Each structure stands twice: as C-alpha cells, then as structure tokens.
Amino acid sequence: MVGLIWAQATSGVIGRGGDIPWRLPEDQAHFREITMGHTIVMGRRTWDSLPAKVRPLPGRRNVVLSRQADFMASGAEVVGSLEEALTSPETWVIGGGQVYALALPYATRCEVTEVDIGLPREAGDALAPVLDETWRGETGEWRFSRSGLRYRLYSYHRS
Ligand SMILES: NC(=O)c1ccc[n+]([C@@H]2O[C@H](COP(=O)([O-])OP(=O)(O)OC[C@H]3O[C@@H](n4cnc5c(N)ncnc54)[C@H](OP(=O)(O)O)[C@@H]3O)[C@@H](O)[C@H]2O)c1
Ligand SMILES: [Co+2]
C-alpha cells in the first residue's frame, strides 16, 4: 500500500515559501496517527522544512528523495528514486508537491485535509496533485479547528 497524505487550501495550495501558511493541531494529530509505525517518504525540500529537533519523525522509517548523491539527512535514508523506498507494507508519501505528483501512479489511498482558507494560487506555490476519474472519494463533515479554520477530511481510494 502506497498512500498520499496532505492538507490543502480550497484552491489546491499545499505549500508556499518552503512552508505551510496554516497550522491545524488536529490535522497534525491525524497525520501522526495515519503515518505512525510506517515508512514516510518526502522530498528533500520537505525534509528541509522540518526543524532539526523534530527530525526524523519518531517511530517511522524516514526516507528522503533527492537527486544529490551526497545529500545527508541525519536520521533518515536518502534515496535517488521512489521505487527504492517501497519495501514496506505501508508507505505514506508526505510531500511535497513534486513527490506527490511522482508517487501518484503507485498510490491507492489519498488522505486529504481540506482547509477552509481562501488562498489564491501564487507563482512558486506547491499544489496538490490532480486526481483523475479512477479515484473514489468519501467526504467527512466540516469541523472547526481550534486555530479558527474549518477543515474536513476526504478519503480517496482506488483499486
Ligand atoms: N500537507 C501539506 O500541506 C504539505 C506536506 C509536505 C510539504 N508541504 C510543502 O510543500 C512544499 C515543498 O514541496 P516541493 O514540491 O517544493 O518540493 P518537495 O517535493 O518537498 O521536494 C522536492 C525535491 O525532491 C527531490 N526530487 C523530486 N523529484 C525527484 C525525483 N524524480 N528523483 C529524485 N529526487 C527527486 C529533489 O530534491 P534535490 O533538489 O535535493 O534533488 C527536489 O528538489 C513546502 O512548502 C512544504 O512545506 C506541504
Ligand atoms: Co497505520
């Protein structure tokens, strides 16, 4: 099983300026529950975005995709291709925009947090991947985050 997990604004923006323009503790807890114990695969830019104290995320095989053969991600594996990372029962791709697009052919699950923030797309933004007609979706109810933004979970799946 390869799954993708991400949070997006209603516009599809998932990242700006190398970070994320919101922070929902509830979504972080959801992310932790879904990924805990499994492989997590991330692009090098997303690894860069994690603070050194939080890196690697605990209890998970942290894998970083990079074309730099000498890139060092202390506490993580650095691989040059996505296929190298797929050696575990569950693999969660945790971003960013480039790696979501790269991993989508391998994917049968997408756990998507829609954040009710009106965030027009700007040049340089990272965006959520486009899901074609093979994906079947199940939508949760809108919830209030303590941060003040509403959010809802979509669970997309396909054979
Ligand atoms: N849920 C969310 O909202 C969420 C989750 C994660 C990240 N983000 C955001 O997403 C943004 C980063 O996304 P990004 O798209 O800019 O970069 P990214 O996908 O995180 O990492 C891009 C890097 O991955 C490596 N890479 C990409 N394709 C590769 C391939 N085919 N083979 C080998 N290595 C490859 C390269 O690393 P080298 O340059 O080292 O070769 C490339 O520079 C940040 O803003 C981050 O905060 C958002
Ligand atoms: Co699990």
Domain ranges of the chain: 1-159
Contact 6, 112 (CB under 8 A): yes
Decide yes or no: CATH 3.40.30.10 for domain 1-159: no
- Protein residue with its CA nearest to atom 9 in ligand 1: 15
State the virtual CA torsion across 92, 96, 99, 100 in degrees, nearest 10: 70
Q: How far is the CA of 71 from the centre of ligand 2 (A)?
A: 29
d(CA 107, CA 78): 21
Contact 4, 110 (CB under 8 A): yes
- Model resolution, angstroms: 1.8
Q: Are strands 143-144 and 150-157 parallel, antiparallel or unpaired?
A: antiparallel
Closest ligand 1 atom, CA of 19?
Answer: 47
Would you state the structure tokens that stand for residue 130, as one six-digit string? 């486009």
What ligand is nearest to the CA atom of residue 35? 2
d(CA 61, CA 88): 9
User: Which DSSP helix (H) or strand (E) runs through 33?
Assistant: helix 25-35
Query: Is any atom of ligand 1 closer than 6 Å to the C-beta of 19?
Result: yes
Q: Which of 5, 50, 67, 151 to mutate to test the pocket of ligand 1 (most atoms within 8 A of CB)?
A: 67
The single-letter DSSP state of residue 19 is: B
Compute the half-sphere exposure of residue 34: CA atoms within 13 Å on the CB side of its CA.
24
